[PDB]
Amino acid sequence: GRLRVVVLGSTGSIGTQALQVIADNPDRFEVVGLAAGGAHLDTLLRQRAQTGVTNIAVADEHAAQRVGDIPYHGSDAATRLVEQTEADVVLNALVGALGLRPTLAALKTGARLALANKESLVAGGSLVLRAARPGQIVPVDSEHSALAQCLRGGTPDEVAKLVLTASGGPFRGWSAADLEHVTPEQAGAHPTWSMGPMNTLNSASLVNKGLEVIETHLLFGIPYDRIDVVVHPQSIIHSMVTFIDGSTIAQASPPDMKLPISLALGWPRRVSGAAAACDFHTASSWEFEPLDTDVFPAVELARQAGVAGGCMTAVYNAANEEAAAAFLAGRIGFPAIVGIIADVLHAADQWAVEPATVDDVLDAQRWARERAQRAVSGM
Amino acid sequence: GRLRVVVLGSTGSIGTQALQVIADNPDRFEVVGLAAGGAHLDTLLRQRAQTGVTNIAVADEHAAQRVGDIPYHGSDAATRLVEQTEADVVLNALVGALGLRPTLAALKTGARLALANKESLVAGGSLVLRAARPGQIVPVDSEHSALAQCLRGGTPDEVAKLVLTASGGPFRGWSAADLEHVTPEQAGAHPTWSMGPMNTLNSASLVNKGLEVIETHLLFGIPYDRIDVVVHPQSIIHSMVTFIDGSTIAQASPPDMKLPISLALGWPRRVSGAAAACDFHTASSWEFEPLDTDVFPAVELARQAGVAGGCMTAVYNAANEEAAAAFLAGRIGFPAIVGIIADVLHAADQWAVEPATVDDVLDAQRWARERAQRAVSGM
Lengths: 379, 379
Fold this sequence. Notes:
2 copies of one chain form a homodimer.
Chain A lengths: L2 E6 L4 H12 L4 E8 L4 H11 L4 E3 L2 H7 L4 E2 L3 H8 L4 E4 L7 H9 L3 E4 L2 H5 L2 H7 L5 E3 L2 H9 L8 E8 L9 H4 L4 H4 L9 H8 L2 H14 L6 E5 L5 E7 L4 E5 L5 H9 L17 E7 L7 H11 L3 H17 L5 H13 L11 H20 L2
Parallel strand pairs in A: 1-2, 1-5, 2-3, 3-4, 5-6, 6-7, 8-9
Antiparallel strand pairs in A: 8-10, 9-12, 10-11
Helix pairs in contact in A: 4-5, 11-15, 12-14, 14-15, 15-16, 15-17, 16-17
Pfam families (chains A, B): DXP_redisom_C, DXP_reductoisom, DXPR_C
Enzyme class (chains A, B): oxidoreductase
Function (chains A, B): Catalyzes the NADPH-dependent rearrangement and reduction of 1-deoxy-D-xylulose-5-phosphate (DXP) to 2-C-methyl-D-erythritol 4-phosphate (MEP).
């Protein structure tokens, strides 16, 4: 029947798309809570008005006064909302380290976690996994959503390889020399999704694919050496699974996040009309090419951090946040993005120990941000 | 555990490939019976020697004496073998009307029917369906095998469309005028599979795709207006399913019938190492284009016979057998192949009644062969 959904990060692109899927399907879903940072308030006010949901969390205190009548405000508003709201699904679409505590709180309640927040897995690692039951986390990322669907093609013992697709970004087929004089607006050219400057940048530097590889390992328990990345410029195939008999099962759709959002909210039940399907009435082609790992080391670096274990993938993510920002702020070169991540990881051998608590993870990320900051300061 | 398999049509390409899969996997499968027509005897003798299976059916009487010590020979040898052999799976890879009685006998025993024989469904229609339990028939055809795998992607009520792929054949993108002066060896040019002159011809005239559309309807209970055909020259994607949310799930592999054979024998359990998987270490492309139904009417004609129901699909198949042979024997033109099928169907309104018995189906096919023969005689 109808599922009660807490929407964390409601004003971002995933949050607003989720609310649209919810509004179109009132028999399947109802919103019971909203959390937002506070950066966008005209949006949050409209969502309050349209849904009638007054059970809202706003992190920013000044934003919280400006909107008025907000029950959860300040530091851990989102966590408190999740702790005190009865729900069937928590959609965690918060950005950054802010998402980890709401994730653990959400898992403690027994609800399904529709996970969009990368930090939860990439930084939380085993902490989050230990907190979750089998099937409790359902991925919202289009690649992981595609994998979950393709995995219906057999039992776990029959999986040979998971194959993630990457667009290649705007610099697909460029030499390392070419990348040396890449500018912020070159990087943020023709984006597949519409989720902001940082996100489009991570697609260009292939760090997004690196983070997804890490999450694939954690979500599906497949070793890093059985997780492939292929470049697929059309971004129509969203991932594939190759099975032990030689069969490959692929998921394909015109890019539209409403599809994986709807599936994550409603899992295992599909949502009629969520997105447009591939249309075969006009000729088209789906192209595949190997990733040039020499020019784009981000994915191999992700594998190195993943295999190292412990707090290393938290270090990889934290270092990218500082390094990628520094590039957008005209302060370092494009190649130096992954360059800095490597330098930080190479210095991070103390963080190869598994974290015991959330504070351990936050300390590692604190360390990595500072170390990356220091590295940026020398350029 | 280990499954007892009766292999009907053991000397043809599907039969010999199935025996190879069986020999490679003695923990999964054992041969308990072999049926062959009698055209190839050196092969049948080698199979007797290697498997030690003396439980053999040979249709041809003269062949049966020549080989020696054959327990089932003559008219309904294959049917008798199936009736009297204890098995878990019957692989029906017989060609033509000869396969229908063994199919019904196989279903009566309770065994899984790994169905390669097109005549069973295309001609048998509702007779065969009424004889089968849910899940009892498992398709061997690479398109139907692909569909069965993709259908794991949701429940039946979530299916929107089934999409079969067709190579387009050697005359893909040719005008109707171009097809008028097509010769037998032009038609049998560069075949995807290796199953004889008739089979390669049916791929060129698109009658093979027409028969597969009919079988798709009967196997999966999807209406003809939700069964699409797309042309896909690489023949790597073997079919797709589009679901109601907009997601498409596709099955892909380098052409090799050992994959679907192995899956049909072992369903639902995959068979490690059956075939090579797609390799993404070298650039490639998968192309899609609409089928030109004006130039290639065979699929639309199949839909017309399928919707008409009763013995009409049996008529479509019987008329093609006579008409396609007549083309290979230098007696009619390429366009006249589907031309004759249309003329026979248009005259076949008495066969729109459902068949009650096997003899009804055989009478319809007898009628259609004669009518097609008469039509050929006037060219």
